[PDB]
Amino acid sequence: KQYIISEELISEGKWVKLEKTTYMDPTGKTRTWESVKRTTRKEQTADGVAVIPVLQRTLHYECIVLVKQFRPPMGGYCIEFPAGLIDDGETPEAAALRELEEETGYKGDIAECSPAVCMDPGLSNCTIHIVTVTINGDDAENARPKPKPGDGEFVEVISLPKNDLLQRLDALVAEEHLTVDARVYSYALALKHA
Template sequence: MKFKNINKLNEGAYITRYDITYETKAGGEKVYEMISRDKNIKDQGGLLKEGADAVVLIIHDESGEKILLNREYRMAAGRWVYNFPAGLIEPGESPQESAERELWEETGLKLLHIDDWMFESYSAVGFSNEKNVCVVGTAAGTFAESTDPTEEIKAGWYTKEAVGSLLKDQHFAARTQAYCYLWSRQ
């Protein structure tokens, strides 16, 4: 594929819609629809931005026997979906600061320590250049309602057995489903 151009079609509060035109290896033209957190992509370099837009928190309890999952009403899906706590990195905020803030805002829990960071990954590479950084760590505390009145989140600790049962008939975000499947079978 050879990049030809990009056109901004619509700018929303959080995402911007673009059409990207490519020349295919057969010499044809392909117009690809995408969304981005970046409101000012003007060329192919803009698609290749540095840094993550958001954090994803893969959190275990202090015993290491339970994993933290949010059951959240997701408006785009029109239903409740299991997912890891996650959120956008605010301007001027480090990924660690974002992880601590998002965990507390969505669950009321405190991040005790970070065990690992995963390299940047794409949220939905089929239609967006949004990137995440995954944080693996441990948290503790008492659950509280989300501090954002527009979010409906029910956070909880789940054992491997409980996760295995949820995977049979509950909706998950893809990244959470994949990780939980492997974790529950260890």
């Protein structure tokens, strides 16, 4: 029953805009909503990618590779899956492998790619592909990985055992002022719940 009637631009930055969304509610009544959108979305099936990078090495427990960065919106450091926006013309998979290498130094192998999933659908239209990638940590290039961070981008790599992920995230939250991402935390919870 529900659908968009109009989208009025309220304020447009270089990267983010605020819109007034007019929609039909299911009783047949017109209602509005304050919506956030990115200015950067062209023909990409999503704004960005998040990478679930499973680091595999013989006689090691599998690790999940995470990154720690300063996030201006948060006024603080956050622990996240490696992630970035999809370049114009770029596939989710190439964006995932490219961002994983830039942020971590690791060269991954694609495992699976989600459909477009919503980041905060009450707030924004922002979507990602969640791309699962395995990293062969026995391969030469994955021996001493060097992040190739872009301009301003400063990332720290944190590799945590998959078999203890939630406890290791809790011990990082206990020991420093830093926020875990909700996708990282949901993934760590499901590893426990399984």
